[PDB]
Design a protein around this nucleic acid. Structure first.
Ligand SMILES: [Zn+2]
Ligand SMILES: [Zn+2]
Ligand SMILES: [Zn+2]
Ligand SMILES: [Zn+2]
Lengths: 196, 195, 198, 197
DNA sequence: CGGGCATGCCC
DNA sequence: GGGCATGCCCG
DNA sequence: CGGGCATGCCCG
DNA sequence: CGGGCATGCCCG
């Protein structure tokens, strides 16, 4: 199917993303590079993504994550787990086995296999920050490596995070590149070295 | 019930031979006598020679089958990984799940054993061409030793059996195999691991 | 294609077999047959005489079909057709479809078949008995693409299968021969003949 | 009707540079100054440097086009042969028929000319990166000079033009190209053949 | 990549 | 027939 | 943890 | 090729 938009749209609520500072130890579980707008993370490890808003979205608002290929020649291809990982015994009880992106720690998560575009996405209700907190954090997990054969096969992906109303209308959108890999700190440091 | 790997030259004096192709980093197929191990690239020609002291009767068949080498893995059927089983690399004759193919023989026959679930590939035995002392079969291995969800860096043995037209055993030999990107580089590594 | 046709020699009830001319190996002779290899070496679009020999005469309605297949088992399911260039080079003889490798010359009753189910190409003419004073029936074939053509045969050897059939397509007889369509048939014949002598 | 090939530096002092990669038998891309001729392998990176004396205005673009070198063949559009046109070698951007592609530039644009039907490939001009004195474009040639039904052993020139945003000419350079299996062998041979006995 | 040789195509 | 130009295999 | 190395694969 | 490097994964 045609590739969903990745255009940054803060919208009426001033929707932005934030990421924890985690450092670049060789095999740190998850690390974000501001200079690349790129997350490096290990398979099945917690990846925190922060939602920041200037004003609070309505009740019933939801937050959706979807992966797409970054490169034009691959844009029409659905991002999914490789044949091996799809057939592994790693089900969390909620996510269909073909889905790359899962959410942990939220029993209200829903998974969509779009009947029109065949793309996968994972969505949770938007909860405003608890009093004393400045942002809302969602814990994602990526369940296949960037390097997997028959899956991403070293082709870079973007994760698109959208804020939507209860009926699915777009309220806001942001995105970040992601590399799922064995050694996120090593690889972040290497990619950062390369723009020099 | 693990297939036998016991060497049996039998009445026809059946032995295997290999081409000695050296250890250039990316040589297609190379055999290590020290290890009795063939190192070869995925989908490329792997020649295996059949040598006999006397000629088996027409109707004789030659079967190849892979098993895991390590005792703890021996009962597991050797098959292509989920990625490679789904690739569009059919030659029109081989089943997509089979690790070992034979190339260049229209009489090739593949078996999924109904009882053991093991895969094998069999061709008719033919005597050497005039002036030649051996019969060469061209095998292809269709998954890397390193493939996740497949061999997963577990060593395999290929067992070559000479059979009569009804399947009775006439001879057996075997060799270890590593299917890899750089067979010359890798042959040298395993050899030095001992001495 | 999902299957492969038989290439087994079958003389049948009429004692059907093939014959070929003695043409020699003068480097660039237009067509030459190697009895040792059962292989015809010829130039693109040049006449390739093939003789049909029979012990008794098949009845009117009998047909003679020619079909190419790849010789190597790993390519045998792939339909032999002309390369993208030759398919488009506007060299029609008025009857042969542009995709067909094998043509027949000089026969107004030639028919070209593109099999709806195997997708294989073939060319067929009515069987005619030999002319007076002759022992055999000669068909003039042409091969319209080189063995070396990219996107075509791509250096893969082919076999031509000649079948004798009744009016319904039932098999009456079969024979086959290898073919290389190349620039220098004499040279290439001699080189391939040398390659056992080694 | 034939596009001009006449070299001229123009007001920005535009000229080309090439990597001097030598003549090892199968070097992937090499350039002969004596012949003003690039020899390169199909689909391999062919770096061409743009050198200017002063920086051209915003919106400047750089176009490449192939034409046959021989006068008898000049009016024929240079295109890929039927085989290569149909190979599964697409980069997702170049039309299947085009001989010349640009690699590693997401802003590449391709043109089939309305009047002449000739093919060209155009990129925005960018000034040299910091610490560099020239701008490099990575071309690929997607058909061999020898291809039957394509160039068929007929020599070609590549014409590189510096253009304003509207397509008006600012500068032009050209070089002969042979796309072949063994660029070093073939370059060394052609240069060996320049002299007398 | 590239030595060795197949294959096109002149003399 | 001779010789060379040019592509391709598999190390 | 970082150092180190095995293994696939790609620029030239 | 074959030197080099990306990437998984082991080891102390
Ligand atoms: Zn995976
Ligand atoms: Zn595999
Ligand atoms: Zn052709
Ligand atoms: Zn071409």
């Amino acid at each position: 199917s045609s590739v969903p938009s990745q255009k940054t749209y803060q919208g009426s609520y001033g929707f932005r993303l934030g990421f924890l500072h985690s450092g670049t130890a060789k095999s740190v579980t998850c690390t974000y590079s501001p200079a690349l707008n790129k997350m490096f993370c290990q398979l099945a490890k917690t990846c925190p993504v922060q939602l920041w808003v200037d004003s609070t979205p309505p009740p019933g608002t939801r937050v959706r994550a979807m992966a797409i290929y970054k490169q034009s020649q691959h844009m029409t291809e659905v991002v999914r787990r490789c044949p091996h990982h799809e057939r592994c015994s790693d089900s969390d009880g909620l996510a269909p086995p073909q889905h790359l992106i899962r959410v942990e720690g939220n029993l209200r998560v829903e998974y969509l296999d779009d009947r029109n575009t065949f793309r996968h996405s994972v969505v949770v209700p938007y909860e405003p920050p608890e009093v004393g907190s400045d942002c809302t954090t969602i814990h994602y997990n990526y369940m296949c490596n960037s390097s997997c054969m028959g899956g991403m096969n070293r082709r870079p992906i973007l994760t698109i995070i959208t804020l939507e109303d209860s009926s699915g209308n777009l309220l806001g959108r942001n995105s970040f590149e992601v590399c799922v890999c064995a050694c996120p700190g090593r690889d972040r440091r290497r990619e950062e070295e390369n723009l020099r």
